[PDB]
Structures are given as structure tokens and as C-alpha cells.
Design a protein around this ligand. Structure first.
Ligand code: PLP
Ligand code: PLP
Ligand code: KAP
Ligand code: KAP
Lengths: 448, 448
């Protein structure tokens, strides 16, 4: 009836980033969403406290967004961008160029964030080959960094739950140290920033001639536990990259489009990427579209007569999908007409105090926040900062507790993520912090 | 204004698989489509003779497909498949399992064909270490194989012009030869087949204890020039993969969903893949949805208590998108109520005769076809079968002539690809083949 839908799900599906024995024990099937809440096939409603995995902006069944896709259906759903283009993709490219960092003048589409990162890495590799510098073939990427699941993006990721096993498949990369101030040693953001930059510079001084690009998440590392970079760090990596002739790839797939209370997160420190990835909330969270921005200097390294062999030979079949681009176009009009970014910045002030209060809980160790990008790191001892053994599944148990309490999210290890939709109201925010607090306590007061 | 949308496209876009200097010289912006024709912003109409790069099934503005997406907007556009599922992804999963090879019982969603292949390759690699055979970690891919553009897909793909700037970023891979009947000495499909299988068997015999999987396009190598595998070749590959304990990965991204006159091309030789990649036409050409099918034996090697770390740690954020899944569900209902596959198979009989007439031209060296998947290889000499030098751009020029004559396709080197929508009538196919024949004559008669 809907009983059968549940059994079908367990019989035919294989779900991303999930142990299916876990799914089969606690299955959940979503049927509709309205505002910032989704509804399962039984009629239970849940706050979407993780924005459907960090991509949902205006909430669900956002009226203008729905209208924008109906309008485009009435014209054409998809025609190709291989050797040509279409209207919404071209319009969107100009709108994207207008709001991104000033040095990024080019828009290369694809389907997902891993793909946009996969394209940034290939662009950066082929640039140096193109301009007669074929030795520049290694990458630097940051520890605790994550850039997607395909093999290039994996070669540049460093979350060892996900990646360690795939080492034989990975290309040659250096891993640079980032600040993780919470379980640091001095606990000072300036000291941690300066030490990690010092070590970046020494790595660069020794090997830059072999290195095409450096990859880094913009301001906040997400899959690693919503670890926010100390002030001045990102701008410090930009300078080091410029100085040692390494292209800087900035990953904005999670932080992009208002998430950190700027349109793009590298605005906090005014950094200009050479290459920049984006996805998730670009479409409001409706459809798979992704982008790699490039500078003009990069673009023209590939512009030449065709048998001069400059061409970038990459491109997915759905590249520039009109349906995706149309809803992205409306999304960005909503940012403008709603003043979304400003409202996120305002609402994050009070949210700040709401989140700092969780510290009152015995097993909450750290609270991290930049805008609407937050994590509560759970700890078996605040004093110690010693974490619970992984085998007690504390983050997992907390997610399940929140779920029965009517709120959806996913933990990053024992870090409880909180990335509520950008349209979230001040009262919705406090209603979600309250459920999260209740859940952490109920689970954690028993150290399950 | 037409002229400034055109100048915006030259200014802010970087297109897929395109030398932007070629684009600038000959810009083309599509506005709408109706049935199997698309229309540019100047109002000029074109036959869609490459199905918008091999993905459009029913034409454009297909009413049923249109209704299906509108109906889904009215419920929800995207909620996550991480740790949970939704209604259309669940229903779609069931239907896909029913129409796919019987041994394939499991569906793992993604956004694109490359991502589906990347998933297949990561499943094969981790499968063997989950069951305690870490030795089995190498891949075999077929000479002239194309599996997508992301780094893992290109590590198992061999299109010299595409891959191998990127040599340094692969991942070593065993390359086996495919029978290329047209420019082979005997040729003779049976002689070719059996010798390429003798070389595979040799490769397996020596290295099979190191090999995780063999990766192969299903029945036709597309990007390499629409090269049809001889009868018995695919069934022999499968047999040798079984004999030597190597998983068979089958790429159906281009051939899948009716293209070759079967629902899946592997049905031609009755082959059961271990892992099967699909995409493109899965949605009728409307949206980016892809699938990796897996057997239950493979699924169950990642199925275990979370602490025994069996889990597949992979999954894009738009996995199981309701919008793509909804349109795909309706796409498949059409295959059923419109008997698309049987209609393609039937129409393909007369079509073969249209294409044999094409063969009458002095510079048409070969015609290749399986269902609606066709290729007309151009040669400067049809008795020596010598190719035009690349530097005289014969494929590119033919595609531009077809353009002005009102038809879109893309060449593969000097092979003119012909992949018309599956809804194409008998009349429309002959209209299309005639425009293609005129354009080959007008370009090629001037080139000696
Ligand atoms: C989401 C994420 C990705 C991967 O994007 P997908 O669409 O899931 O493939 C890449 N980089 C960052 C920083 C991300 O947050
Ligand atoms: C189209 C294709 C791919 C890649 O799919 P995308 O959606 O373009 O990334 C991979 N393998 C084959 C055989 C294909 O035809
Ligand atoms: C567009 C998609 N990446 C695809 O697989 C098509 C095959 C390669 C396309 C090369 C061309 O048509 O110019
Ligand atoms: C969904 C997408 N692959 C993404 O970037 C999130 C990765 C980290 C999420 C880990 C989890 O939620 O379990």
C-alpha cells in the first residue's frame, strides 16, 4: 500500500553514503515538501535541518521556482551545448559572471560538484601543458578536505573514511596541513593560521615547479565537520599560490549561494580564485547543475586554431540543461528580490547565541558557525575533548533521535551538522536548534 | 536582440568538447523544439539528427514527459537519497530492475554516464577488498573505449585526442584490442572476433589474479566512430570474464534505452553484466539522471554491520532527484504504450537501405549500423580506404553543411554520426539521410 513501497525500497535500491543494513532497519521515504519541511509516505513531517544535504535554499515547492520550470518546459527541456548553446544557459552564464569574484569571467557547466571539481583539476593540468610547462602536473590539497566522489576529486580529497581505500587509483598529490583550532594545542586561531601557512610556503618553496594547482574548500570544510578557517587563512593561501605560480581552485559547492551569509564564501576575505567550483544550491536545490568558473587568462590558453591542439576535450551530455539553468536563473532572481544573503547574515547573529547555548550540554564540545553553516561537535569529555569511541555511533544515534523528534540532518562523524534552508525564519531556526538540543541530550545523557 | 545574446555567449561561456574559436566563427543558439526538430533564435529549424547527443528519445516538448514533470513539481522537486529515499526514485528503481538483465537486481543513482562508470569502477575495486582479495585491483578496458570525462572514466578510456594529455593522472589499465572490421586486413567479422578474443584470453591468462574488472561499451563503440562489434564478440568477452573471475562492466550510456533496437544492447548477445552503466536516454533526454546496475552478489559484499567497514562511501547530492526520476518513469511507460523498441527495430530495416544508397558516394568508405545507432565513415579513397588528412577537417565541414541545410549532428573524426530520435518516422529518416547525403557530396566532391 505504502508498506509495499517500503519493501520495494529495500529490495531494489542501493543508497549513496549509507550502510543499507542501517537503511533497512530504519527506512524513510519522502513524498512531498512544503516550506522548510518534508513529509514522509505516512504523513510525518520533518524540518529539513540539513537543507536536503546543503542544497535547498528557498524551501520546497517554492512557487517562483516551480513556475520558472513550467515556463521553460513550454519551450524546450534540453538541447546540447556541444558546438552550440541555448538561451537559459547563456543568460545564466552572464548572471553568474556578474555575482562571482571579478576575475572569473568564464562559465563551464556540468551536472554535479564532483564534476565541477574534476573539470577544475583538468583545466589546471592542461593549462600548463598548453603554455609549454608540462612539468607542472601535481596538486596540493588540504587535510580534512573533500571535493567529491569521482576519482580525480578523490585524489584530491582527504577524508579517510571515504578515501583511504582508493589510494592505488589516485594521482600524485601533496596534502597540506590546515588549521583545526578546536582540538589544536595552543587553541589560538592566529598561531594556528600562521604555523599552517608557514608549512604551506615551505612545501611550495620546495616543489611549486611540479605543481599545477592547489585545491581548498572556501572558508569552511564541510564533510570534515564544518571546521571554519581562521581569519586571514584563505587569503594567506591565495597569496602563497600567486607567489609560487600555482593556480588556486576554490571549492564553493557547499558554501556557494548565500550559505555562509555571503553570495560566495571567498568574499569574507576578498579572495580571487583562478578556478572555482559551485553546485548544490545553484538551482535552489531543485535540479543537478554545476559550474566551474575560470579566469580569462586560463580560458585563452585553450583558445586557438583547432589543429594547434589547445582545445579542452571535456563535457557531459547534460551540460547546460535548460530546465536546470531556468530554475537557477529564477533562484538568483529570488536572491536579489528577497535579499536572501542579507537576511542570512542578519538571522545568523541570533542563531549564534542559540547555538552557543548548546555548550550548556555536558557532551557538546565545540560549536562552529559561519552564517547558516554550522556544526555541533559531540564529545565524551569537554574538559578532555576526548571523543566517544566511534563504535558507539553517537552522531548516528543523534540523527535518528532528531528524526523521530521531527527534524532531518546528518552527522559528520560525531559532529552534528546544521545547515538549515536560507529561507528559514528566526522562529524556525530556534525551533530547530531546540529539537537538536533535546536530541543531543536524550541520546548523550545515556552515552548511548 | 539576437546579436547581443550571441555576443554574450562568446563572452561568458566556455563550451564542452568545443574549440571556442570554432564556436565564435559559427555561433548557434537554440530556443525551442517541437517533435524531432529544434529552432534557433533567428527562427531557423533543424532536424535533431544526433538526438541532442544521443539522449533525446521522443522528440522535444513531448506532452506526456511534460505533464510528468509538472505533476512532480506539485509534490517535491528534490529530497535526498543519503540515508533515505523518495517515491519516484523508489518506483523508478523497480521498473529499471524489471527491464534490465535478470542478474542485475540493484540500482545506484547518479547524475551522468561518467559518474555511473566512476561508480561501477569503484564498486568493482572495493568489492574485491571487502571480500578479502585486495590483490584484485587492476582494470582492463578496450582499445578505443570511451567511458566519460572524469579522471577514473578516462583511466579506463582510450581516445587519444581526448585522453592522454591526462596520461600522468591515470591509473594504469590493461588495454585489449577490439575487432575493427572495416580497416582490418581480413575483415571478415568472424576472423577478427576470434583473434581479439585470443589476445583477451592471453591477457587474462597472465594477469587475471590482479584484475578487478573488465570495462566495455555494449555492442557499439560510439565516440570512436560508431564501431559495431561483430556477432559473438560480446558473448565471448563475458565468457572469458566469467572463466577468469573478472567482473564485467558494461557501458550502456549511449546504446541503452532503445538505441540499438533492444531495450539494452547486451540483449543482442544475451549478456548479463556484473555492473551496468546507463544514462542519456533514461529520461527521454529531459534531465540528468544516471544509473549503475549491480548484481546482488556485489550489493551484499557492502552489506554488513557499519563497524565492519563494508559501506560504499560514495554519492552525489542529487542522486535520485524526483524531477529526473519522474520524467524517466514516464519515459519508460511510453516505451511500453508506444512499443518504441519494436518500432525502432522495424524502421531500422528500411533505414539500412537508405544508408546503403549513401554508400554509393565516392568518399563514403563504410556504413555502420545497429538499430538507430549509425555511422558513415568518410575516406579520401574508397579503394585504398585511406583517410583524409585530419588537417582538412572533413567531418567538421560536413556537420556545418548539414547545419545550413537544416540538420544537426556531430562527427567523430571523419565519421558522420547518425543517431536520430527513436520517435523518428520512416519519412523523417529519409528526409534526414538525404540532407546528410547532400552535405557529404557538397563538401567531399571539393576535396581530393
Ligand atoms: C557537495 C560537495 C562536493 C560534491 O558535489 P556533488 O554534487 O555531491 O558531487 C564537492 N565539493 C564540496 C565542497 C562539496 O560540499
Ligand atoms: C555518453 C557516454 C558516457 C558519458 O556520459 P555523460 O553524461 O556525458 O558524462 C560514458 N560512456 C558512454 C559509452 C557514453 O556514450
Ligand atoms: C558529450 C558526452 N560527453 C559524450 O559522451 C559524447 C561523446 C564524446 C563527444 C565528442 C563530440 O561529440 O564532439
Ligand atoms: C552528498 C554529496 N556527496 C556531498 O558532498 C556530501 C558528502 C559528505 C556527506 C556525508 C554524509 O552526509 O554522510
Amino acid at each position: 500500500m505504502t508498506h509495499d513501497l517500503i519493501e520495494k525500497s529495500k529490495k531494489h535500491l542501493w543508497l549513496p553514503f549509507t550502510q543499507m543494513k542501517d537503511y533497512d532497519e530504519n527506512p524513510l521515504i519522502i513524498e512531498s515538501g512544503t516550506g522548510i519541511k518534508v513529509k514522509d509516505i505516512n504523513g510525518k513531517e520533518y524540518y529539513d535541518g540539513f537543507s536536503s544535504v546543503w542544497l535547498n535554499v528557498h524551501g520546497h515547492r517554492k512557487k517562483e521556482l516551480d513556475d520558472a520550470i513550467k515556463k521553460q518546459l513550454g519551450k524546450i527541456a534540453h538541447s546540447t551545448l556541444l558546438g552550440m548553446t541555448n538561451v537559459p544557459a547563456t543568460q545564466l552564464a552572464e548572471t553568474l559572471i556578474d555575482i562571482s569574484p571579478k576575475k572569473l569571467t568564464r562559465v563551464f557547466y556540468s551536472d554535479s560538484g564532483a564534476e565541477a571539481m574534476e573539470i577544475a583539476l583538468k583545466m589546471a593540468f592542461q593549462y600548463w601543458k598548453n603554455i609549454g610547462k608540462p612539468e607542472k602536473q601535481k596538486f596540493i590539497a588540504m587535510k580534512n578536505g573533500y571535493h567529491g566522489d569521482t576519482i580525480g576529486a578523490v585524489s584530491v580529497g582527504s577524508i579517510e573514511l571515504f578515501h583511504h581505500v582508493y589510494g592505488p587509483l589516485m594521482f600524485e598529490s601533496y596534502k597540506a596541513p590546515i588549521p583545526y583550532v578546536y582540538r589544536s594545542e595552543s587553541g589560538d586561531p592566529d598561531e594556528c593560521r600562521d604555523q599552517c601557512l608557514r608549512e604551506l610556503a615551505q612545501l611550495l618553496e620546495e616543489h611549486h615547479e611540479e605543481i599545477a594547482a592547489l585545491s581548498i574548500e572556501s572558508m569552511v570544510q564541510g564533510a570534515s565537520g564544518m571546521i571554519v578557517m581562521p581569519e586571514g587563512y584563505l587569503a594567506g593561501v591565495r597569496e602563497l599560490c600567486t607567489t609560487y605560480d600555482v593556480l588556486m581552485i576554490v571549492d564553493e559547492v557547499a558554501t556557494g549561494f548565500g550559505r555562509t551569509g555571503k553570495m560566495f564564501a571567498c568574499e569574507h576575505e576578498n579572495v580571487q580564485p583562478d578556478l572555482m567550483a559551485a553546485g548544490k544550491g545553484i538551482t535552489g536545490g531543485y535540479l543537478p547543475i554545476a559550474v566551474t568558473f575560470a579566469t580569462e587568462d586560463i580560458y585563452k590558453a585553450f583558445y586557438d586554431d583547432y589543429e594547434n591542439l589547445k582545445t579542452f576535450f571535456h563535457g557531459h551530455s547534460y551540460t547546460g540543461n535548460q530546465l536546470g539553468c531556468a530554475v537557477a536563473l529564477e533562484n538568483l532572481a529570488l536572491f536579489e528580490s528577497e535579499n536572501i544573503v542579507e537576511q542570512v547574515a542578519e538571522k545568523s547573529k541570533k542563531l549564534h547565541f542559540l547555538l552557543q547555548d548548546l555548550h550548556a550540554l555536558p557532551h557538546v564540545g565545540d560549536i562552529r558557525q559561519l552564517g547558516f553553516m554550522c556544526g555541533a561537535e559531540l564529545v565524551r569529555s569537554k574538559e578532555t575533548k576526548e571523543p566517544y569511541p566511534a563504535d558507539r555511533r553517537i552522531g548516528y544515534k543523534v540523527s535518528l533521535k532528531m528524526r523521530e523528534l521531527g527534524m532531518l540532518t546528518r552527522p559528520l562523524g560525531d559532529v552534528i551538522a546544521f545547515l538549515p534552508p536560507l529561507a528559514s525564519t528566526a522562529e524556525e531556526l530556534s525551533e530547530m536548534v531546540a529539537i537538536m538540543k533535546q536530541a543531543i541530550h536524550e541520546v548523550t545523557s545515556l552515552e548511548d
